[PDB]
Amino acid sequence: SIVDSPYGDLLSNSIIYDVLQTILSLACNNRRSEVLRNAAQSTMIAVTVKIFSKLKTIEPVNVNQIYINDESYTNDVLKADTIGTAYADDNYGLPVVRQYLNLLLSLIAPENELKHSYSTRIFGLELIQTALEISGDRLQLYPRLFTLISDPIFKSILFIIQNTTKLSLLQATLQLFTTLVVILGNNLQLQIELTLTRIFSILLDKPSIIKELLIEQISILWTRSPSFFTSTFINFDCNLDRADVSINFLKALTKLALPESALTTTESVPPICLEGLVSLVDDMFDHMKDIDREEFGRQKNEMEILKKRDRKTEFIECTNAFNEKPKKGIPMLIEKGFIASDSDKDIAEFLFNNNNRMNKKTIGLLLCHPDKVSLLNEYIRLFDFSGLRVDEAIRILLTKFRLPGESQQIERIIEAFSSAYCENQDYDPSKISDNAEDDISTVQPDADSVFILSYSIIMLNTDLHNPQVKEHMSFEDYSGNLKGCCNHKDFPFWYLDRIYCSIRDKEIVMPEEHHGNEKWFEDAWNNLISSTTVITEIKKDTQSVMDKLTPLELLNFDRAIFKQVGPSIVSTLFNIYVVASDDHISTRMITSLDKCSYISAFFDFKDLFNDILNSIAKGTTLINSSGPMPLVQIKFEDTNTEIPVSTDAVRFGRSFKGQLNTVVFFRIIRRNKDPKIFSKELWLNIVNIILTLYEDLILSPDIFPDLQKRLKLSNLPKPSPEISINKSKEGDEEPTEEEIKSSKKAMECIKSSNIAASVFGNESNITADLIKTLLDSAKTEKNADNSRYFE
Amino acid sequence: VTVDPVTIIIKECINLSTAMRKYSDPFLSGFIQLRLMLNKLKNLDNIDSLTILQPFLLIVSTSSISGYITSLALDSLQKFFTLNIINESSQNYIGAHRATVNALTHCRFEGSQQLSDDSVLLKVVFLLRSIVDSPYGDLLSNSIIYDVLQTILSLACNNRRSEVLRNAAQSTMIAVTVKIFSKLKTIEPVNVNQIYINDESYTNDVLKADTIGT
């Protein structure tokens, strides 16, 4: 009651932190109660809602500044329940929300698995999910909370996904992951790539229940994320130095859609995969609302992003060559379009940009060379420091470098760092002594001064973050060691205090941490955190790259992804349509096939379009190439009609899939706008289906009667029937009432298929090929089996 | 707010559907239908909130379901409320909230031992307090709020329950009384000239027995 009131909002950070501690201790302590625990959980949920709502109305601080991650992640611990039996003294703000997020992380920490129960971890994940769903982008604006979400919370999420079996923790973890990807997906690209790769790996090889839950949550991911698979394609497949997340995702979905994949997997997965594929097709179709395909054809240039995306395989080959040996890799990179020129500026730019798919230790070993020492001077000139209190400069330098073991190369690295630090910061003669806590106008060492300070910093890190070294290093000893420093003077007390504390409660992050096993997950996440979340420069972009793309380029990306993943999708769609048995699933499948035909016709994919149409024709089971039931024409004694009872008649009347595919096929033919899209097999199939539908059933030879009336010729001779009877019941007993009504149903379907306007009158289907095939498919022989209609 | 509430709705729908499937028919069908309808959507406009809440309210009101399922349903309802999924900018929000409160009032279930019953009843009472003490609860109806008073007071006075549940019911009753008379402070007074005669009967309303539960 207090917290959810203005009086609560006028409290202090320490008080509200103690409130959080006590309420959460009551909520997540066994042996207390159940009703009391639920009340405490609801109270904690409400308090979190209020806290982050208050966070929503606080302006950001230092928007233009660059943040160097230095705060520790193990400063808050949930103290044991004992109730019964800026700075503090302010009015809330960022300190309380930061400490609350830190405590929540301590709840779900991957190194605290043995110290907390599963209900506590699920509750912590739920609290984090509520906080995210309340704050979102406004939370993304602030740097420390975004760091605590990027590195450690997502590390915990990935660890839980990889190494859990309770499935109740897994459900909460997957829900939080989906919430993160939906809300703050555009700023957590690397984490999403890693998590999705792990999920695909686990899903393609543990009980089936885990895979079912994984696929269900990831399914709820793609439906609601705006225009999925194409944002993923753009951000990952076309960005290089990453993995083809979208293409691999679609390939795994196609591999998991067949019933052969329904085996040794939960049977509810295949419908989910089919929904995903249908969603991709529908998204592509919706992207073609009003595009005027002529305009698409008029386009000449291709997006340079796609051009580089087509060059990715040779990029991987060049990267492997570079990792093997730089003296051979560099000529290979400069031969192709990756490296602009042999100028060291371009080489430094490349070595700075793509520090994700380049062996960092190999980079360090290469860069120690003399010519590579000149390259190193240019490369560190490429950096940007603007102060950073020396230690943050060291962190920046070591983010994308593995220091070689030998001391000579370390000396070269540190001296180049000193020179670049001097160059990138213009010192001033102020040089204020104590009683000056800032670093811009005050601390101003020299080249050898910062050299000594940086060597001391490295020594302090390697001495204070190794458990195998007895004792530690104190502030007094370190300060005494750094006597005889800048300007032959000593550093200020505040400066050394800050440096010592910063290197104390944070280990310097370095890439290529280990090589082996038993720490593979820690190594992977270290090579992730080394890239981001140590530097968080907010670009304040309006949205993801999706919105800043013109509709033509969006359609181009759709065309590329379809070119990659089309044949597989259409193959699995036809497979499941053949297997399918239910009415609704078959109708949805054939609608998806119709949309696929439309999309193939839009992008002028002749092979795919003819493949899908020919598959429809062969599934029609009406144009097969390679017992005999004579056809019977039915005329009543009243209300004269025509009911031809033939083999194909009953075969069609007892084929739901047959009629569905016929009507869809002729609808597709109706929609067509180009004649030079079909194939010879396609034209043969359509001419044959129309001919066999003319032999019997309902295709009257009244097509284009205007010409017949022009020459005053009579109606065409109707093909004779094999066994024609006239009924007086309104004998030899050939027809049956149910087969009669089945033939009537087939007649109704065929007359509803509007064949005449579908095939002939479309102003485009009338081309040389159609009439040429019509003439070639003629008959010139007088056998009895065909004399019934030969003339 | 600004957090695409349709995503929260679909998450709760898939959660409840998965729970029912694991525990194991019209309720699951309604959840699936709502799932599809919301999936083919982009915001919450042009669709009445009563349709969104109807499966959840129906699964709350039904008597022959397990306590775990209705507990999950009530948790989903409270998450819907606390995130303001249904607001003043939604169709039939008056009807939606009135239906939610009506379904809560006549809640029933069956299942496990007294601890689970106490937990689900506590969730019910918390949701009723959260909704009445809010503006939306102020925009309820006379009969609905009278029924809320009847149910909460009956639960409080019943001696066959636990102690914590009775304390929670007492606290909620005090809060609801405070809210009712605080609203009474704002109503424009009735005729101050005509003389009133106390012909209205003094005893017609008798507290009913507890009905929510097994």
Numbering used by the authors:
A (entry chain A): 175 to 259, 321 to 440, 454 to 874, 887 to 990, 1004 to 1064
B (entry chain B): 7 to 30, 70 to 259
What does the paper say about this structure?
Arl1 is an Arf-like (Arl) GTP-binding protein that interacts with the guanine nucleotide exchange factor Gea2 to recruit the golgin Imh1 to the Golgi. Interestingly, Gea2 is predominantly composed of α-helical repeats, with six domains arranged almost linearly from N- to C-terminus, except for the catalytic Sec7 domain that rides above the HUS domain. Gea2 is a highly elongated and crescent-shaped molecule, and two Gea2 molecules dimerize via the DCB and HUS domains to perhaps confer stability and structural rigidity.
We determined the cryo-EM structure of the Gea2 dimer at an overall resolution of 3.7 Å. The three HDS domains (HDS-1, HDS-2, and HDS-3) were partially mobile and had weaker densities in the consensus refined EM map. We next performed masked local refinement, resulting in improved EM densities in these regions. Indeed, the homodimer of Gea2 is globally asymmetric due to the conformational difference between the two arms of HDS domains. Interestingly, the Gea2 heel-like motif is highly dynamic in solution; it is invisible in the Gea2 alone structure and becomes visible only in the Arl1–Gea2 complex.
